[PDB]
Short mmCIF file of C-alpha atoms and ligand atoms in Angstrom, two decimals:
data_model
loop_
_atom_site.label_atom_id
_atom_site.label_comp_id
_atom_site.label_asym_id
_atom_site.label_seq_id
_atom_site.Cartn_x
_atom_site.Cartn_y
_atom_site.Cartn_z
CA UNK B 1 0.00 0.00 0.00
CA UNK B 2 1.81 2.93 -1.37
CA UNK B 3 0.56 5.72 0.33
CA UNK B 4 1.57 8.54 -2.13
CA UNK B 5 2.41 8.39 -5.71
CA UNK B 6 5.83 9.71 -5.90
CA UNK B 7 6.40 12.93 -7.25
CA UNK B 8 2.93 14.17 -6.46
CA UNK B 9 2.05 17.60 -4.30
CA UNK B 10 0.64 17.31 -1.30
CA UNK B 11 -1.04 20.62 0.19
CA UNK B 12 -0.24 20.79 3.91
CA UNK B 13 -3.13 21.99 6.56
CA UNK B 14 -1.66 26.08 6.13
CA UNK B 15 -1.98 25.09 2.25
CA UNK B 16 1.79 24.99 1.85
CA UNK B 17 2.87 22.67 -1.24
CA UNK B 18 5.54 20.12 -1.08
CA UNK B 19 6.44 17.67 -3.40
CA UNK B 20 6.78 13.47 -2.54
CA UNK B 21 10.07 12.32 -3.30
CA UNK B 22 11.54 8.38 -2.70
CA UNK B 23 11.71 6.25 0.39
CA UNK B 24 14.57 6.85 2.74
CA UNK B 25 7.99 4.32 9.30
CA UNK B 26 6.70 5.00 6.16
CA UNK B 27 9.53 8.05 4.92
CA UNK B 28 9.45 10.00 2.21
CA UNK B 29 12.49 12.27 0.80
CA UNK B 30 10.21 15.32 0.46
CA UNK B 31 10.79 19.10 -0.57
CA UNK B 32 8.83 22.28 -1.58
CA UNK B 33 7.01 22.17 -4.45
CA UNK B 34 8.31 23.17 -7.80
CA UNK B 35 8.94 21.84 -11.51
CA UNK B 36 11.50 19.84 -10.39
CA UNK B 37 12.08 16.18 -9.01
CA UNK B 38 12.20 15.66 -5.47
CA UNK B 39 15.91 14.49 -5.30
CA UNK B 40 18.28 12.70 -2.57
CA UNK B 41 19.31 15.73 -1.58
CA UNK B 42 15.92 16.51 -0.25
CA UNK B 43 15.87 19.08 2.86
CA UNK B 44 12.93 17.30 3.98
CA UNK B 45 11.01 14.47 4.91
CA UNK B 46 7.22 13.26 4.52
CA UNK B 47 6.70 10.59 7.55
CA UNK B 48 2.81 9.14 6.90
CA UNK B 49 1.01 6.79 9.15
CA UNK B 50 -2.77 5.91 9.47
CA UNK B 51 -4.68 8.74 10.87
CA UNK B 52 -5.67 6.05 13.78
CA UNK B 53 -1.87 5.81 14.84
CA UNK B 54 -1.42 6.66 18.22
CA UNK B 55 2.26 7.32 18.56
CA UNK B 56 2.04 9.91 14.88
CA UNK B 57 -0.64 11.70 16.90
CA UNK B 58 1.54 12.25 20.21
CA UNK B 59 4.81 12.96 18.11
CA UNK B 60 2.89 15.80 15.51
CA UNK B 61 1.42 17.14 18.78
CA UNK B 62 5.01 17.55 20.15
CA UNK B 63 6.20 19.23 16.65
CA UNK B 64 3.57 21.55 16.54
CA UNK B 65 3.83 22.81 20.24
CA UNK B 66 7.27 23.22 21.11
CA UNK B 67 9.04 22.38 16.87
CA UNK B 68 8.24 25.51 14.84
CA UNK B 69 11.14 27.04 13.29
CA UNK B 70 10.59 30.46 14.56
CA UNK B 71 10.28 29.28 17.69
CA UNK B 72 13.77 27.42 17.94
CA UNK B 73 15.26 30.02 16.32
CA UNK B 74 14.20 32.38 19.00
CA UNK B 75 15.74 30.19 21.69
CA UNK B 76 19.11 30.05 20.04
CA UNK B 77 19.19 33.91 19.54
CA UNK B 78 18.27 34.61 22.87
CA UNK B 79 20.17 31.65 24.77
CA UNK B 80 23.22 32.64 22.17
CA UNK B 81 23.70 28.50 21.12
CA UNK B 82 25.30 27.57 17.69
CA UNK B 83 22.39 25.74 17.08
CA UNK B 84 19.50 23.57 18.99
CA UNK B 85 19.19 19.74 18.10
CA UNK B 86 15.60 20.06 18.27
CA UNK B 87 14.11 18.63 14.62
CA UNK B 88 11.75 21.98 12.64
CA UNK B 89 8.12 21.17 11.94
CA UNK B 90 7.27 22.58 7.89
CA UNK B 91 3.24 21.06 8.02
CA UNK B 92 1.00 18.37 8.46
CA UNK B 93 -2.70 17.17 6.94
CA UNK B 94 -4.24 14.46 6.49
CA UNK B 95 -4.21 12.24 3.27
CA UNK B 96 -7.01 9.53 2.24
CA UNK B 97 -5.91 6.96 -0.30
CA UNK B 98 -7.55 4.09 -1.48
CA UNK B 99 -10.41 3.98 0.71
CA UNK B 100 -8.10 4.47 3.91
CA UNK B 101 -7.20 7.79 6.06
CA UNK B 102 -3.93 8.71 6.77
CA UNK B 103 -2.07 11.94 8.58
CA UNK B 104 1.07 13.03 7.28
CA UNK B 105 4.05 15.46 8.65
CA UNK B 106 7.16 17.40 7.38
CA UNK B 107 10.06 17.66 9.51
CA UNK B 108 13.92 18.22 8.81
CA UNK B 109 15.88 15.32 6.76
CA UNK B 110 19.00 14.37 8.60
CA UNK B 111 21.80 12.45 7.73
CA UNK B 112 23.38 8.89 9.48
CA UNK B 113 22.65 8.16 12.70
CA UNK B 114 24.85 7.55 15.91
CA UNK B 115 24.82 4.39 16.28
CA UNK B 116 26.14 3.59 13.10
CA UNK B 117 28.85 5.75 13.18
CA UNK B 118 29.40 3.92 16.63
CA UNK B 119 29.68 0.62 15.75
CA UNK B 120 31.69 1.71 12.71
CA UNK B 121 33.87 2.79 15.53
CA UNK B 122 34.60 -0.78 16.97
CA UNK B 123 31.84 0.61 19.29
CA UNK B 124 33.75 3.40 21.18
CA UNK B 125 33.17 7.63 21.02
CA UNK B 126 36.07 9.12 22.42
CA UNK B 127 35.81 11.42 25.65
CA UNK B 128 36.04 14.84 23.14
CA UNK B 129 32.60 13.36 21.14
CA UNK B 130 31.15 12.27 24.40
CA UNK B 131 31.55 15.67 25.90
CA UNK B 132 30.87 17.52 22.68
CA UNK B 133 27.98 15.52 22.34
CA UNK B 134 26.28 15.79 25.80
CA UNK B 135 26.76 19.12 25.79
CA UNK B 136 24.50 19.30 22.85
CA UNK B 137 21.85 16.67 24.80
CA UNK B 138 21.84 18.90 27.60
CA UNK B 139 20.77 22.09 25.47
CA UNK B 140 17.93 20.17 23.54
CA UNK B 141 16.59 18.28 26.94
CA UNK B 142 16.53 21.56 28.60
CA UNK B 143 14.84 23.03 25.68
CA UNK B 144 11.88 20.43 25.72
CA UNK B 145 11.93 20.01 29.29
CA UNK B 146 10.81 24.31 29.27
CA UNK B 147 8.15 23.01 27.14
CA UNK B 148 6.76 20.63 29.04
CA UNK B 149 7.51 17.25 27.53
CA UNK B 150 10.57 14.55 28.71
CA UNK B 151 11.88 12.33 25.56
CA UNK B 152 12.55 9.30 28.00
CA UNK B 153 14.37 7.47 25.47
CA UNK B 154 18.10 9.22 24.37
CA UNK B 155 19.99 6.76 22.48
CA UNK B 156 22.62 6.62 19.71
CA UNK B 157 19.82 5.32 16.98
CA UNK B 158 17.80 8.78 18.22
CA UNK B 159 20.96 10.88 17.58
CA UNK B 160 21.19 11.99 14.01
CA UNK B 161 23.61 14.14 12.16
CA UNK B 162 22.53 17.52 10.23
CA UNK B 163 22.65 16.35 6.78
CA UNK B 164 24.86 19.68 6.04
CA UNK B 165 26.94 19.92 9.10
CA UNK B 166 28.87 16.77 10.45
CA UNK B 167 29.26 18.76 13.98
CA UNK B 168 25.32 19.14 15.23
CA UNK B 169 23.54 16.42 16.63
CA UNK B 170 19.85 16.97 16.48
CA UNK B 171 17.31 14.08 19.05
CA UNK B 172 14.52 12.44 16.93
CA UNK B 173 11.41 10.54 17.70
CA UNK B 174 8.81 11.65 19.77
CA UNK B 175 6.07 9.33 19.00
CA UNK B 176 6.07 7.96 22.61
CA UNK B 177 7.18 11.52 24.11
CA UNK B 178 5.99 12.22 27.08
CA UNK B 179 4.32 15.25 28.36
CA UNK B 180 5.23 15.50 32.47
CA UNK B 181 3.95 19.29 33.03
CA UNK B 182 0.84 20.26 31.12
CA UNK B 183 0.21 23.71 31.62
CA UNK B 184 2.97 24.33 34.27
CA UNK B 185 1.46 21.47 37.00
CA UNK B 186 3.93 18.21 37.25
CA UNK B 187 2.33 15.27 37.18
CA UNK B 188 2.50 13.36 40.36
CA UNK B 189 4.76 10.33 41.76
CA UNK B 190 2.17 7.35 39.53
CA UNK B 191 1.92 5.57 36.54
CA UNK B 192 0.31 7.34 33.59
CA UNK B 193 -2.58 4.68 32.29
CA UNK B 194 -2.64 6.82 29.20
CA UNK B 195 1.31 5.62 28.66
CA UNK B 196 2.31 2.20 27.68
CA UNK B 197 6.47 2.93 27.64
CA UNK B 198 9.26 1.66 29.52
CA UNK B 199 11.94 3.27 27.41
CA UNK B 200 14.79 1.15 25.88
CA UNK B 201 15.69 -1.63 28.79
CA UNK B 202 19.78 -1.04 28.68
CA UNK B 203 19.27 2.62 28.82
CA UNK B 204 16.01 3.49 30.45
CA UNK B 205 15.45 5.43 34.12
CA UNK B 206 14.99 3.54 37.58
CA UNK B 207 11.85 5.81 37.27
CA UNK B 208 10.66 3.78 34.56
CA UNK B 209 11.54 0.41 35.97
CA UNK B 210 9.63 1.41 38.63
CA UNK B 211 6.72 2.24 36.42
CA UNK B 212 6.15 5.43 36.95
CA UNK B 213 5.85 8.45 34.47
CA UNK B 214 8.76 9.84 33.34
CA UNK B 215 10.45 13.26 34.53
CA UNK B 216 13.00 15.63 33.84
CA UNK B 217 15.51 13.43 36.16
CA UNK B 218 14.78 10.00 34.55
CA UNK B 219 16.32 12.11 30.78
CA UNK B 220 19.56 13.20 32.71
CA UNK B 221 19.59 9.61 33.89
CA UNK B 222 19.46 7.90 30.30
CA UNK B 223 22.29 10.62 29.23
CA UNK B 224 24.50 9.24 32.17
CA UNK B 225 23.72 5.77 31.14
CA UNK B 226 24.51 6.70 27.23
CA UNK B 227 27.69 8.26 28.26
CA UNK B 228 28.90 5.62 29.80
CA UNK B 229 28.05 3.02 27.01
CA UNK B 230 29.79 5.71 24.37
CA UNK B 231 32.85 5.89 26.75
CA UNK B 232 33.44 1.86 27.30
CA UNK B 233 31.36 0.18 24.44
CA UNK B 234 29.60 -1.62 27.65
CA UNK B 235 27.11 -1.03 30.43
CA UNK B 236 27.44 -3.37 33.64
CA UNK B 237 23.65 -5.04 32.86
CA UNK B 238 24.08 -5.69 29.09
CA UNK B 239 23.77 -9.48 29.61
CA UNK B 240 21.05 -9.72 31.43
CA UNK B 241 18.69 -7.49 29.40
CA UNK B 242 15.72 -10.36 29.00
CA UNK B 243 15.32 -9.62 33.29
CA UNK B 244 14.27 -6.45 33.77
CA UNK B 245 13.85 -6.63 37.25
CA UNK B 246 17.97 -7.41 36.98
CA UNK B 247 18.32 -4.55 35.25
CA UNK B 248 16.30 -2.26 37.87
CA UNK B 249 18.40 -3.79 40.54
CA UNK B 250 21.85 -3.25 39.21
CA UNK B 251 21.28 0.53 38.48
CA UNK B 252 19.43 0.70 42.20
CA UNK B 253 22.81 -0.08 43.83
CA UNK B 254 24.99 1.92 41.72
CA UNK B 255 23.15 4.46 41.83
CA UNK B 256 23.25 4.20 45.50
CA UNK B 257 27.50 3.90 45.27
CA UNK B 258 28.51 5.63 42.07
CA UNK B 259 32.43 5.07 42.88
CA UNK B 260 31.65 1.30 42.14
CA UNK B 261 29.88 2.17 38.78
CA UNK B 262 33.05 4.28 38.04
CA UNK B 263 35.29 1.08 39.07
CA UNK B 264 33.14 -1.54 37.17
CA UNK B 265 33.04 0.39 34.40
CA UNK B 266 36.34 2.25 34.08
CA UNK B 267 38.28 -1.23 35.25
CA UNK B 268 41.87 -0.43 36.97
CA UNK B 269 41.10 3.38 38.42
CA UNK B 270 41.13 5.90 36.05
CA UNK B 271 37.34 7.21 35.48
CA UNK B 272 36.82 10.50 34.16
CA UNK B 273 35.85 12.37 37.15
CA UNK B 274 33.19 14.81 34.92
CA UNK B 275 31.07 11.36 34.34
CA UNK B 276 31.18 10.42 38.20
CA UNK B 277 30.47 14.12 39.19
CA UNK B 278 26.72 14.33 36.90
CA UNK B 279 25.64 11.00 37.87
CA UNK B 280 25.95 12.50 41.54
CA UNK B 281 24.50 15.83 40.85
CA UNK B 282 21.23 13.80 38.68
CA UNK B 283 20.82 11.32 41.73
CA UNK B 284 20.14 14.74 44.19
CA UNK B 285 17.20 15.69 41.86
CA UNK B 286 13.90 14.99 43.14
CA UNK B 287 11.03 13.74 41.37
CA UNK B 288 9.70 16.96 40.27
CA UNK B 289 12.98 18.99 40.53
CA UNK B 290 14.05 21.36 37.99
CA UNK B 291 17.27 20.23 36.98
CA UNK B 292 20.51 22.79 36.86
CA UNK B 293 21.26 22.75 33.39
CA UNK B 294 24.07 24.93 33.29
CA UNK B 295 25.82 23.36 36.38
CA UNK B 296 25.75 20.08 34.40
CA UNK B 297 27.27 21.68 31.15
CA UNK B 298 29.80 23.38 33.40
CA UNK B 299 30.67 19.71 35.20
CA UNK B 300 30.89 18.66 31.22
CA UNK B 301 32.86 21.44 30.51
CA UNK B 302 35.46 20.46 33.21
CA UNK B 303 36.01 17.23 31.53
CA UNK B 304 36.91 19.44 28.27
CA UNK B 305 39.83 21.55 30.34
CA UNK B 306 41.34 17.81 31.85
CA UNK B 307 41.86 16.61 28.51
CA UNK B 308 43.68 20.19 26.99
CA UNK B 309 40.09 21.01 25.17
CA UNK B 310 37.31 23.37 25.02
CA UNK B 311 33.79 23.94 23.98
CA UNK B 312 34.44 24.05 20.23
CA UNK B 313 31.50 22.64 18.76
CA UNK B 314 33.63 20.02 16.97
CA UNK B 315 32.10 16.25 17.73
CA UNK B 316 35.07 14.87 16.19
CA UNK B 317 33.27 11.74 14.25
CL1 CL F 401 8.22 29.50 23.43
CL1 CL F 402 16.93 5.13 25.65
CL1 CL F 403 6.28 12.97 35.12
CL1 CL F 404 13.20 15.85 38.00
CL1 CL F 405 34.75 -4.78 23.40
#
C-alpha cells in the first residue's frame, strides 16, 4: 500500500505545497514544491502513518507545540547557542488513499545516525565526542523540558547528524514523548494509564523500571547511562537485558554507590571524574525537581579543560 504516488504535491493543513520524493515508518524524501524532481538531496522528509496511529498523533502534537522554526530560532538567539538539536516542523494534513485515512508530517531530513557511526567505531566515542555531544543533549533536553515534555528514550539510533553539518547532533522521535507538566502542574509520583512505555531496557530510568511516568531526572539519567556506554562500548547489565527486574536492581545499587559504577566500568582506576560528578548531581534531583542545566554543562565542561580542550562545537566523528 503505497501511500503517495511519488512525485505528487501534497497541500499541507496552512496550504503549503511540497512535493513526494523516494523512500529513505513509512519516509518519504520530500521538498517544496516546484517543476523539479524531489531528489536525494531533499531538505525534507514526509513521515505518513494511518490517521488512527497513536504514537504519529503524540509525536505531531510535540512538533507543533514546542518544533516551529521560529520558535527554535528564537531560543538560540536569545540563549546565544550555535544551534538547537531540536528537529523543525514545515506542516502536516491528512491524506485519504484508497479507501483508507492517513495523517502526514514534514520535519527536517537528517543524515546517518549515531549508532552507526558507533559501531563503525569498533563501538567506542572518544571522551572529546562524548563531551561535545552531551553538551549538545543537555541544550535540547533543557529546551523540551521548558516546554513541558521529557523524551525518556536518548539513544545513539535517536541521535542523528545535520545532513549539512557533520558537527550538530539533532534528538529524533517523539512518537512515545511524554508530556510530564501540562500547563505548568507536574504530574505526580504514579503511573500514567494513558502511557504504555518503559523506554529502551539497557538505557532506560529507575523511574521507569519502577513504572512510573517519566520526569526531567529519569532524561539526565538515560544521558548518564549513554555516556557511559559511548565511553566503554559496555554497560554493567548488558547481559542480562531479557530480566528487567535485573536490570532495575543493578542501576538501584549503583546508583546508591557511584564510585563502584566508576570502578566496574572504568576497570583499573582511572574514570573521568566529569562522568562520576553528573551522575551525583542527577541522583540529588527529586522527582519533580528542575534540573541545573548549566551546572551540568559546566561539570561537562570540566572534563573538556582535563583533557587540553574546550567547547568548540567540533564532535570529532
Ligand atoms: Cl516559546
Ligand atoms: Cl533510551
Ligand atoms: Cl512525570
Ligand atoms: Cl526531576
Ligand atoms: Cl569490546
Amino acid at each position: 500500500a503505497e501511500q503517495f504516488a511519488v512525485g505528487e504535491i501534497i497541500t499541507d493543513m496552512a496550504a503549503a505545497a511540497w512535493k513526494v520524493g523516494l523512500p529513505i515508518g513509512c519516509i518519504y524524501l520530500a521538498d517544496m514544491n516546484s517543476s523539479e524532481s524531489v531528489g536525494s538531496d531533499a531538505p525534507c522528509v514526509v513521515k505518513v502513518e494511518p490517521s488512527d496511529n497513536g504514537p504519529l498523533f503524540t509525536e505531531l502534537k510535540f512538533y507543533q507545540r514546542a518544533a516551529k522554526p521560529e520558535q527554535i530560532q528564537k531560543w538560540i538567539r536569545t540563549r546565544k547557542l550555535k544551534y538547537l538539536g531540536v528537529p523543525k516542523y514545515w506542516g502536516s494534513g491528512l491524506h485519504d488513499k484508497n479507501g483508507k485515512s492517513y495523517r502526514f508530517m514534514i520535519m527536517d531530513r537528517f543524515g546517518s545516525d549515531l549508532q552507526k557511526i558507533y559501531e563503525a567505531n569498533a563501538k567506542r566515542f572518544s571522551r572529546k565526542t562524548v563531551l561535545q555531544l552531551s553538551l549538545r543533549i543537555l541544550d535540547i533536553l533543557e529546551y523540551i523540558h521548558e516546554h513541558e515534555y521529557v523524551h525518556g528514550d536518548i539513544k545513539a539510533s535517536n541521535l542523528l547528524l545535520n545532513y549539512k553539518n557533520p558537527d550538530q547532533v539533532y534528538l529524533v522521535d517523539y512518537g512515545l514523548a511524554y508530556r510530564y507538566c501540562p500547563e505548568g502542574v507536574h504530574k505526580a509520583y504514579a503511573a500514567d494509564p494513558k502511557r504504555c512505555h518503559d523506554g529502551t531496557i539497557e538505557f532506560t530510568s529507575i523511574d521507569a523500571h519502577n513504572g512510573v511516568a517519566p520526569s526531567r531526572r529519569g532524561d539526565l539519567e538515560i544521558l548518564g547511562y549513554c555516556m557511559i556506554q559511548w565511553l566503554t562500548g559496555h554497560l554493567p547489565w548488558e547481559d542480562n537485558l531479557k530480566d528487567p527486574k535485573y536490570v532495575r536492581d543493578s542501576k538501584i545499587r549503583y546508583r546508591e554507590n557511584i564510585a563502584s559504577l566508576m570502578d566496574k566500568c572504568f576497570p583499573a582506576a582511572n574514570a573521568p571524574g566529569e562522568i562520576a560528578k553528573y551522575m551525583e548531581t542527577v541522583k540529588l534531583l527529586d522527582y519533580t525537581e528542575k534540573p541545573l542545566y548549566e551546572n551540568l554543562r559546566d561539570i561537562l565542561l570540566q572534563g573538556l579543560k582535563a583533557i587540553g580542550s574546550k567547547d568548540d562545537g567540533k564532535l570529532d566523528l
